[PDB]
Design a protein around this nucleic acid. Structure first.
Ligand SMILES: [Zn+2]
Ligand SMILES: [Zn+2]
Ligand SMILES: [Zn+2]
Ligand SMILES: [Zn+2]
Lengths: 52, 52
DNA sequence: TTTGCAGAATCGATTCTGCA
DNA sequence: TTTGCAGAATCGATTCTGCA
């Protein structure tokens, strides 16, 4: 439950898994319209709303 | 007192002059450290504080 | 009728939390 | 003990406002 990079602590493994993407670079949420990509749903949800 | 581009209205000519930079591209406030540049003082003040 | 500073509000975009 | 959604809080960076 600890980001081995930034040292912050996170309520679950699930989320840690996710939180790591932002160090690792993994961005699995792909935009159906442009090549913008996202490590977390909320961000794609935002991008979709604001640009599409 | 009206931005001829976005149509917003601005309390003075002074500021309009400034506000236009962000359409025109003029960025006259130069960073003494990197090539980052700014149309408004506050922004350079921020950049300076946070990155230098 | 104009110049200015120093901070507020806002914006785009992200990560974290409440609740389920 | 784990998955998830939908929104909060935060972040970096900018433009606008209060006050002088
Ligand atoms: Zn981390
Ligand atoms: Zn897109
Ligand atoms: Zn304008
Ligand atoms: Zn700089």
């Amino acid at each position: 439950r600890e980001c081995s990079y930034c040292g912050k602590f996170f309520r679950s493994n699930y989320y840690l898994n996710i939180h790591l993407r932002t160090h690792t670079g993994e961005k699995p949420y792909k935009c159906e319209f442009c090549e913008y990509a996202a490590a977390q749903k909320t961000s794609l949800r935002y991008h979709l709303e604001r640009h599409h």
